Design a protein around this ligand. Structure first.
Ligand SMILES: CC(C)(COP(=O)(O)OP(=O)(O)OC[C@H]1O[C@@H](n2cnc3c(N)ncnc32)[C@H](O)[C@@H]1OP(=O)(O)O)[C@@H](O)C(=O)NCCC(=O)NCCS
Ligand SMILES: CC(C)(COP(=O)(O)OP(=O)(O)OC[C@H]1O[C@@H](n2cnc3c(N)ncnc32)[C@H](O)[C@@H]1OP(=O)(O)O)[C@@H](O)C(=O)NCCC(=O)NCCS
Ligand SMILES: CC(C)(COP(=O)(O)OP(=O)(O)OC[C@H]1O[C@@H](n2cnc3c(N)ncnc32)[C@H](O)[C@@H]1OP(=O)(O)O)[C@@H](O)C(=O)NCCC(=O)NCCS
Ligand SMILES: C[C@H]1O[C@H](OP(=O)(O)OP(=O)(O)OC[C@H]2O[C@@H](n3cnc4c(=O)[nH]c(N)nc43)[C@H](O)[C@@H]2O)[C@@H](O)[C@@H](O)[C@@H]1N
Ligand SMILES: C[C@H]1O[C@H](OP(=O)(O)OP(=O)(O)OC[C@H]2O[C@@H](n3cnc4c(=O)[nH]c(N)nc43)[C@H](O)[C@@H]2O)[C@@H](O)[C@@H](O)[C@@H]1N
Ligand SMILES: C[C@H]1O[C@H](OP(=O)(O)OP(=O)(O)OC[C@H]2O[C@@H](n3cnc4c(=O)[nH]c(N)nc43)[C@H](O)[C@@H]2O)[C@@H](O)[C@@H](O)[C@@H]1N
Ligand SMILES: [Cl-]
Ligand SMILES: [Cl-]
Ligand SMILES: [Cl-]
Ligand code: NA
Lengths: 210, 210, 210
């Protein structure tokens, strides 16, 4: 439990964590430690020091910066709130290759992966993930803890509800609103508004029931 | 109507203008003023000085560089010709992150957005838009005033007619020719030549009549 | 047959060669010569000196670095082995804009084109092509001589067999394995494992027989 000072604590030790650790390192940040619900190790050289019960200990020793590297949107949002209650600040992990327009408003805890572009006047909620290669055109609104998967793309003026997930290569045409907790499958091309809490798949994307 | 000297005049004050203004600024250019058919303001800090009737006044005061930031392809092409008749030179707006091969031939008035790649020996007509994240592989020919939408991709040796539009995430396989004034819907994957003036949608893209 | 010393020999003189030559040049490498089965010229200024029968002559004159710029996967793999038997080392051609994570394992003879991202702990076999704009998320395994076409994307933990080909804009969801010698058509979205030697097309991708 002997750590260096000044680095970032990561919640989560999975594949998403690996990519986040490397984004932070590419920016010259140090990653201090991981907390993982499997408390057994290291992820890309970063020690796993315990489960979330280790958070108070980490804060006590002076570490105060944290990122939640958990892909699950509702779990990520809960763990973000837990981290803030424990006195951590949620950093953003923005790969140096990402292009984020100067008029974009970013929340906290946001992952913006390599190859991303986000254009003018888009707003990105806390704990959003904008994954590898994704594109966000002008005037989009991304709600807290939503996830745009790798190689997905939003055309202009799209709104994505809290905790919504767009799978790899999903596309949304201009002006469309997607509700909270909605899942667009890989490749789905969304051509009309989607309400909350549905799954939509296909070209064009259609809602799938039971 | 008091402007600085030396900057670029933009025709159009919408979302496409915002992204173009930011591309020009990212290259260290200054944007002088906007002319918009709604002559009422500012777009990202750039004053709207009037409608197109203000063009002669702008030229008289020494401004001579212009970009047409209008997404509509036929309107953009008409306004490009109007600007040149009024003594403006059409600049290109190429985001610093775009990768444009040294053997690509670029026209004038061309937008090439963040994250774009254009590979060897492609030719890009005047007033084309190559939007955010789009890919153009080797030996493509893009006609004047066509538009490749965000995250679209052309494989090698594709020809795109004048004023044709490919929606977000559209894909075209090698060797395909797309006629002038043709629209490929978002996500459409074009696997055979398309004639002029049709709409094609789907995977694979199929022509849609009335 | 008078060449400079120190440059890279390219097998293949087609469109893929053009893009590879430009990637090598963008890194400050010199391309010495091309060998092409049509021995008649130059490709982007690089002389075509003969067919593969010229390889021994090139090695004798001190050239020892080679890239196989042939899109055909089985032919590329055969010509890679021929080049190594003739005493050449297979270089990699990685465009300066590509983002290749520090924990990625690269083979030899690999093309990684402009705009590519490859994330943590992916392994890339000899003679793979990762084409323009393609994305490879964490923990992927790309077999020797496979080809990810332009704008294609693999989500995390995907395995792609030897000589498999994914067409422009193909997508594969997490955890999927694709067999050797399998072809995914342009735009195909692969949602379950594919065996060896099939063709799969569509959203979702389905195997097509005769
Ligand atoms: C849509 C998705 C959520 C469905 O999961 P699921 O509901 O367990 O679906 P199943 O695998 O049982 O498949 C149900 C049917 O829909 C089809 N299907 C599955 N995913 C599909 C997709 N993305 N597009 C179109 N059809 C799809 C399947 O072929 C199956 O068809 P059948 O009825 O003919 O068998 C999932 O396949 C998906 O696309 N996930 C995206 C994951 C991702 O991109 N992660 C990146 C994270 S960084
Ligand atoms: C194809 C498109 C042009 C159609 O507009 P439209 O003709 O007004 O079409 P509608 O919205 O009336 O839909 C007609 C039908 O085609 C379907 N459809 C619409 N767009 C589709 C698309 N991209 N792919 C497949 N099907 C589509 C709709 O589901 C509707 O189906 P229905 O008959 O079952 O209701 C439009 O949806 C589109 O894709 N635009 C791309 C815009 C864009 O990408 N802009 C980026 C600018 S930077
Ligand atoms: C799938 C592919 C390999 C098929 O080639 P093919 O077997 O000669 O197929 P055909 O052109 O005869 O078309 C067969 C049918 O499948 C359809 N089809 C072709 N390609 C398709 C694709 N990518 N997705 C869905 N359907 C497709 C055609 O519409 C045709 O339909 P029909 O039965 O209604 O006429 C090819 O179209 C393709 O996608 N190539 C990708 C090439 C590429 O991306 N190169 C980039 C290199 S860097
Ligand atoms: C965006 C990515 O999201 C997901 O990747 P991921 O890293 O979130 O998923 P996994 O690789 O399963 O890793 C999840 C990790 O998250 C840990 N975890 C799960 N729940 C908790 C928790 O409550 N607290 C802490 N501290 N850690 C938790 C797990 O023990 C596991 O190590 C997947 O859906 C991937 O497909 C995708 N690349
Ligand atoms: C590529 C983009 O194309 C389109 O964006 P856009 O900026 O062209 O569209 P809008 O946001 O409607 O803005 C168009 C602007 O263009 C102005 N305009 C429309 N016609 C004229 C004109 O004739 N002259 C001048 N000077 N301006 C004109 C309008 O008053 C309006 O302000 C949309 O299709 C978007 O989806 C897309 N991002
Ligand atoms: C990734 C790319 O793959 C393919 O492009 P490509 O450059 O491999 O294909 P082509 O433009 O036909 O060029 C193939 C070249 O490869 C040469 N070639 C073909 N066979 C041989 C060979 O055995 N030895 C040598 N030294 N050269 C060979 C041909 O004479 C021809 O000049 C296409 O499928 C494209 O769509 C794609 N951009
Ligand atoms: Cl570190
Ligand atoms: Cl300015
Ligand atoms: Cl050279
Ligand atoms: Na990209």
């Amino acid at each position: 439990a002997s750590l260096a000072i000044g680095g970032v604590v990561i919640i989560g030790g999975g594949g998403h964590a690996k990519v986040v650790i490397e984004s932070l390192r590419a920016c010259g940040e140090t990653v201090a430690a991981i907390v993982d619900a499997d408390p057994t190790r290291a992820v890309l050289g970063v020690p796993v020091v315990g489960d979330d019960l280790a958070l108070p200990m980490l804060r006590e020793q002076g570490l105060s910066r944290l990122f939640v590297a958990i892909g699950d949107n509702r779990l990520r949002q809960k763990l973000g709130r837990k981290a803030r209650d424990h006195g951590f600040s949620l950093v953003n992990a923005i790969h140096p290759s990402a292009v984020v327009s100067p008029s974009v408003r970013l929340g906290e805890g946001v992952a913006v992966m390599a190859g991303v572009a986000i254009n003018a006047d888009s707003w990105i909620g806390d704990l959003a993930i904008i994954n590898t290669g994704a594109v966000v055109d002008n005037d989009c609104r991304l709600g807290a803890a939503c996830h745009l998967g790798p190689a997905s793309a939003l055309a202009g003026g799209v709104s994505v509800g809290e905790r919504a997930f767009l799978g790899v290569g999903a596309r949304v045409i201009p002006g469309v609103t997607i509700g909270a907790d909605t899942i667009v499958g890989a490749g789905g091309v969304v051509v009309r508004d989607l309400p909350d809490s549905v799954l939509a798949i296909g070209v064009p994307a259609k809602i799938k029931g039971d």
